[PDB]
């Protein structure tokens, strides 16, 4: 007896924004009954292959389909299935077809929203770009909002490039080294996300 051979014919039957239905067929058990199947996934951003959560939570050796859950929207996924018997965990299957999860509203706001400095009468606002795996859809962009500290009305502008990390508000009447409340939000083709927390940024 020895650990099982590779499962076979792993297919993505359906895929949503956060879930995928997987199916496969058994390989050789090598004279010890297969008692468990586990699913792994790989993205362009993972450190190799990684375990994923499934329904059912534990797939027994008599089950050949399962729903993978907790997937990242708008991310290219491949999956593989591994069998285990009493002797040990077996060899992984060949990977499934590559499929991208569906789009969804963006959920992560930009980190380290800050700013400061610049040339005369400039207000410089900066943030860390939201990485591609957290944009959750095409058409990702930012909304930059700022107002003089203590006022109500917001000044807002749409920064349509997902790779943007900086916005400069140039105005000759803007006062020197004056405090501004600043926040940065996100959106994509599915719709509007949230704003970051408010932080205080001074003009030049």
């Amino acid at each position: 007896g020895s650990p099982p051979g590779p499962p076979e014919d792993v297919t993505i039957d359906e895929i949503t924004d956060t879930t995928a239905q997987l199916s496969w067929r058994p390989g050789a058990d090598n004279h010890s009954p297969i008692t468990m199947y586990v699913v792994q996934a790989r993205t362009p951003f993972s450190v190799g292959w990684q375990a994923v959560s499934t329904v059912p939570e534990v797939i027994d050796g008599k089950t050949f389909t399962a729903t993978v859950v907790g997937l990242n929207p708008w991310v290219e996924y491949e999956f593989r299935v591994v069998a285990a018997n009493l002797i040990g965990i077996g060899e992984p299957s060949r990977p499934s077809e590559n499929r991208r999860t569906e789009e969804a509203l963006p959920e992560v706001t930009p980190a380290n929203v800050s700013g400061g400095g610049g040339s005369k009468s400039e207000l410089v606002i900066t943030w860390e770009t939201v990485p591609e795996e957290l944009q959750n859809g095409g058409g990702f962009g930012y909304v930059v909002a700022f107002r003089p500290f203590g006022t109500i009305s917001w000044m807002q502008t749409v920064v349509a490039s997902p790779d943007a990390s900086r916005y400069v508000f140039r105005n000759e009447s803007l006062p020197p080294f004056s405090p501004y409340e600043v926040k940065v939000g996100v959106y994509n083709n599915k719709g509007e996300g949230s704003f970051s927390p408010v932080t205080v940024v001074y003009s030049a």
């Binding site: 930059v144 909002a145 109500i152 349509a160 508000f169 959106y187």
Partner: protein, 157 residues
């Protein structure tokens, strides 16, 4: 304040002196109104030789300019919509969003349209929500005074 040119056919072109905030007549005293958006871009670059003029767009509200001249700075009011001389990399406008108002925006990669088209889009969008259009600006230039989107502010009645 902001670089911009203003034209009225039959008169010399005007431009905004950014240093003192006054409208001034054509430096050559010969240039009158221009027919193409490309020619307006070239004139912007001519009268602002120190600035990196990369595009032009209509202003959103007209301005009343006095002391229009004829050829040769002779016989020096007209309410005209000026053209803004846009500088360097495209920077989207900052829009005032008062309390209870909403920032909306639309980007269409398959559409390359005029300032008037996007103004109409924004105005109709606010109206269909039983609101009024206040500020708006262009997004994503695809040509000289051509754009792929709009940002705009809708406010309660």
């Amino acid at each position: 304040a902001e670089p911009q040119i203003a034209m009225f056919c039959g008169k010399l072109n005007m431009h905004m002196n950014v240093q003192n905030g006054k409208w001034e007549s054509d430096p050559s005293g010969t240039k009158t109104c221009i027919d193409t958006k490309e020619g307006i871009l070239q004139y912007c670059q001519e009268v602002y030789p120190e600035l990196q003029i990369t595009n032009v767009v209509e202003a959103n509200q007209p301005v009343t300019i006095q002391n229009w001249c004829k050829r040769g700075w002779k016989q020096c009011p007209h309410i005209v919509v000026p053209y803004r001389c846009l500088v360097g990399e495209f920077v989207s406008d900052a829009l005032l969003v008062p309390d209870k108002c909403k920032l909306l925006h639309q980007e269409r990669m398959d559409v390359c349209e005029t300032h008037l088209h996007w103004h109409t889009v924004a105005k109709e969008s606010c109206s269909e929500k039983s609101m009024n259009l206040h500020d708006y600006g262009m997004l994503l230039p695809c040509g000289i005074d051509k754009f792929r989107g709009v940002e705009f502010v809708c406010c309660p009645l």
